[PDB]
Amino acid sequence: SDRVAQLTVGNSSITTQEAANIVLAYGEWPEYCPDTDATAVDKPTRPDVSVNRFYTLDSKMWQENSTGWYWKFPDVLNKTGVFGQNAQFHYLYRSGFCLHVQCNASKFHQGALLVAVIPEFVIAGRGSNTKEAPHPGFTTTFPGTTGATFYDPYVLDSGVPLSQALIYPHQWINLRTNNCATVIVPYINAVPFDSAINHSNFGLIVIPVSPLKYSSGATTAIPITITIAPLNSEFGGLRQAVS
Amino acid sequence: SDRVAQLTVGNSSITTQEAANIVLAYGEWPEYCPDTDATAVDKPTRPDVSVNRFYTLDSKMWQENSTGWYWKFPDVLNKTGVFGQNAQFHYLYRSGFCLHVQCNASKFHQGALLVAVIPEFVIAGRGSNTKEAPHPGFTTTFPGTTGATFYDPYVLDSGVPLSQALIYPHQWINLRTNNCATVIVPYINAVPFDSAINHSNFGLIVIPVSPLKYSSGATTAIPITITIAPLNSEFGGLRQAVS
Amino acid sequence: DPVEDIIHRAISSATNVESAANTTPSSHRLETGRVPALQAAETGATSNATDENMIETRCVVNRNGVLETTINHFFSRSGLVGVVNLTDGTGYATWDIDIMGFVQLRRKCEMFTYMRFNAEFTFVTTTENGGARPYMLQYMYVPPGAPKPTGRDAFQWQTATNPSVFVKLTDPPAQVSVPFMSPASAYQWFYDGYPTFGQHPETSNTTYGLCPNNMMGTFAVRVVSREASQLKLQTRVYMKLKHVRAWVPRPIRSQPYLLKNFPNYDSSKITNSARDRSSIKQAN
Amino acid sequence: DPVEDIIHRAISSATNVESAANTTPSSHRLETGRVPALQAAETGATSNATDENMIETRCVVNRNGVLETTINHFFSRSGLVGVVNLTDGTGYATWDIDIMGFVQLRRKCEMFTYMRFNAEFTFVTTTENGGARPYMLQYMYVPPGAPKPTGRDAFQWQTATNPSVFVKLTDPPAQVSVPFMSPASAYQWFYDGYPTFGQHPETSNTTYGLCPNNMMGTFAVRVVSREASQLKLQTRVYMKLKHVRAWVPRPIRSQPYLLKNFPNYDSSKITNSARDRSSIKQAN
Amino acid sequence: ETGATSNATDENMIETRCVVNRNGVLETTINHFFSRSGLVGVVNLTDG
Amino acid sequence: VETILEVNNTTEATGLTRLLIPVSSQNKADELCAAFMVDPGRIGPWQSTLVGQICRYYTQWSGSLKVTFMFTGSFMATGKMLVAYSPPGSAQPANR
Amino acid sequence: TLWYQTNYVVPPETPGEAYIIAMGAAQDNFTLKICKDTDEVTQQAVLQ
Ligand SMILES: CCCCCCCCCCCCC/C=C/[C@H](O)[C@H](N)CO
């Protein structure tokens, strides 16, 4: 009655039989923008079925010497589905999310992942220059659906240590206990509406802390799939398409 | 108080100062599908601002020897805007429309157009064969935003005379009286929802009955613009994109 | 307290009319500002000038009948829809049920776009020299998907599930009633669309206008015998539209007809709607 | 009667806590089924095992203060944010107001993402040999868009609209209060995004992380005189965060700092968070 | 031509939402605009 | 209070011609007439207004705006115009 | 951007070049926050 769960959003549903729990980020639910906090004077669009559903990204194979991964939200969904078409025709944007990272392994495998959610996750450059200076490319800061591997996961590629990164909303995927992590995140920004193309709010991060080990003869290919879903999404400022 | 009107739908508005009246097609307003007439078991999407607004097509120059024109609805809006993206991701479709044909001319010009709305307007072929047989091409039946000129406007290219075509919802653009025609059309089909790609419900038709005449020295270029707008549109059956 | 803007009729009126309208007496108008003769046809409406406001009329209690003009009394008259030719000696004959092949009843049905009716078929079967020979016939109804018969004495004539009618040639003609059998909510005679998805061609697309909600099956007929009798037959099928409702009127055909399923015409010979006269300034 | 489906809270709870928590006395547990020592760290929650359920405790009325640990008493301590060098003989000096250049107050402010505060500046101006020479200074505040001064005696120093402070070197140091001047609703120290649209490059994009909601203007300073006096100056600007609110905590910096606006580090020399020891099996 | 400005509000042009506006119209008055002291004259005195 | 924009601020006008936008009969359809940014406090047509000169004494404006077009042709000339505002995220629209 | 919807149609003996005067103001919810000096002004003397 606690290890079994089902999450139906839109026309899609996720079952699980070996879950742990569900984490609300900072104790709050994603909701629509109230009238006392809105600053635009147009009426927003709210599709509410066509954009609030579970989108499944690609799978990441987890190996012995993986140094870890990061996506940007809502960067990964600007080109998939009707959420990718409403986020290009409209200047303004507001949503929550509901994340789910699946990774199964047998009773003879061991290891652990750290699935956390970092608001305003800024990538650092990797040079000893005091001004010129190195800055990350656009496919490194805004990677898309294929993510990006960390170079230095010990400092999260931002000069900030992983050992204190449990202050963010997070779960663990311990292969002897569970196989999935679920984090529900509200809209966290200093402005009520903001653009979905320039500004990615937060970044999902999956880093294997204890490495994958298995005895000989076991299944060598352990993939990590990620299924995300917008919640309470609304757009504004209709114009022509800009990607 | 009758020649002046304004039509605000969505984020767009049309003014006119020399109008005639507004025609409801068959005395009814476009509305959503009631629960006693629905046959699908999924929840529909209703964007209601992003898809209900005035889309302006291209302009048609009206000359001395024009034999007339026809568009298919909703064919012309399957590739423009967020209505063109909701009509490709979704299998089902239902909407009304609100049409507006602008054509101005001076006090020294003369002529008249017939702006009518024909439900289930089927194009005929033009051969004396009794089976093979000629059939119209796909760009003739489903022309798109560029429309198609009639070959034989006297029989509406369907073996059916123009002189009785006032049984359809229609107005006139008489250049000494008005400059615009407005027709509001509900959803007319034998099924509650139907596909927006295979089946175009009705066809707007602008045919100059009395020809354009002007004395020498006047402005020779008289264009005809058409501004249409969906009303109470809703979609269903989410899938991948098919154009 | 939450977001506020999430919180946020017709024209016509039917009257039971029994007889034609009356006429009230009138007088003469000598005043300005009130004019019933001036109209504006650009508004898309018809003229509403009654004859009491044009001339001086009398009081006429009108007792004429407006009963035979309704759409039930107009379509409940059975006409020919198909002729099935059977020459015995393959032994049987089929007929795809499509009433768009004969032109007396087609043009009446092309006044409207959507029609919802029941039917009442009648099969008048004769020989080629007039008829009346005491042989026994079988008329099956084959729905779409059912196996059509492939022989004179095949096993599809066992007829354990679908309807069939046994009647001799020398009996009165057989007559049944047929319900609304379409999967949609109305038979549509004009379907501006394509049945399937895909890349549609430019040269010859034989699928434009095909409405599969109207294809109702196959009508098969044989002579119930073992040895092949040698006699040529014709059946004639008469459909009577009853319990009929009609929607969305459209203009009546003015060009001569060509194919069953397609509304073709020839453009090199377009017949004028009004037959010619000498000049415009004389009436005869 | 119309379409039906058009018709269709939190967790935390704040308590006013004055002193630290007490301790209630405990006893020994000899029973099965009830276990406070077993946790599950995979659920994303911290352990809730209190010390009354691990050992046997006594009754302690705790009277310690939890007052100095709040975010108002932690940030209301003024520290150095900028040093403006003025050598007279161009005659003036400017300073783009950016407090991310000195590292004592930067690392305290990088604990959080969004902060909303008022400020209280103080300008301690001395000479290069210690100070105290009776000359008069002018400190303008130039908002974004206002014309910066282009000379020692230019017309932008007339100062008819924007604020300015006249104070000698031999007075006590000048001190003002500054409101929340951002166009957004919070100063954000980490902006994962780009300021403008367009094709962003791969080699060196110097605009990644630039938040224009934080750029607050320019601070200019001159010596109020006609002939150029010849004396080298330094001002020191001390910001005190008051009336401060903070959101979304984040981990504290562990790598040595490099640039003002960008959170760079070198990957070839990554300093470990914990200084090394001999082995894992001994404590000293 | 009537010498008056346009009175078309934005609720009658497009479809708007409900916005409770809490912005300040205090610093724009003519007292807060002119109560900022600026230079008006420079007097040169050379003694001897 | 409505004051006049200088939409025709080219290097050719040089005078009171700068205030007015020319129209004429076009040979092609779909054509463009004029264009300007919406920025009180930027170099361009707004600089010659009471809005664009009081928003230079102040930083950080907020709120809606309005643009009124008056036509100064003859009485017998007719026509229609499309006036379109497009929010940021791209360059000036290339067609209608 | 201003676009031609249809055309500028004109009868004979009438000029075919007309003008448009464009105006601008602010709505009822317009505000302004921080007072500064304007950049429209220069001076290099005392205006003797
Ligand atoms: C033994 C009885 C056999 C005869 C029974 C016939 C039943 C089938 C009749 C279905 C209803 C009429 C068929 C449809 C009408 C039109 O032909 C189609 N809509 C063609 O468009």
Ligand SMILES: CCCCCCCCCCCCC/C=C/[C@H](O)[C@H](N)CO
């Ligand atoms: C005569 C008085 C001149 C001094 C007045 C200074 C007022 C400007 C201070 C604005 C508030 C602090 C500036 C912003 C803080 C941080 O440096 C930025 N957010 C940098 O990210």
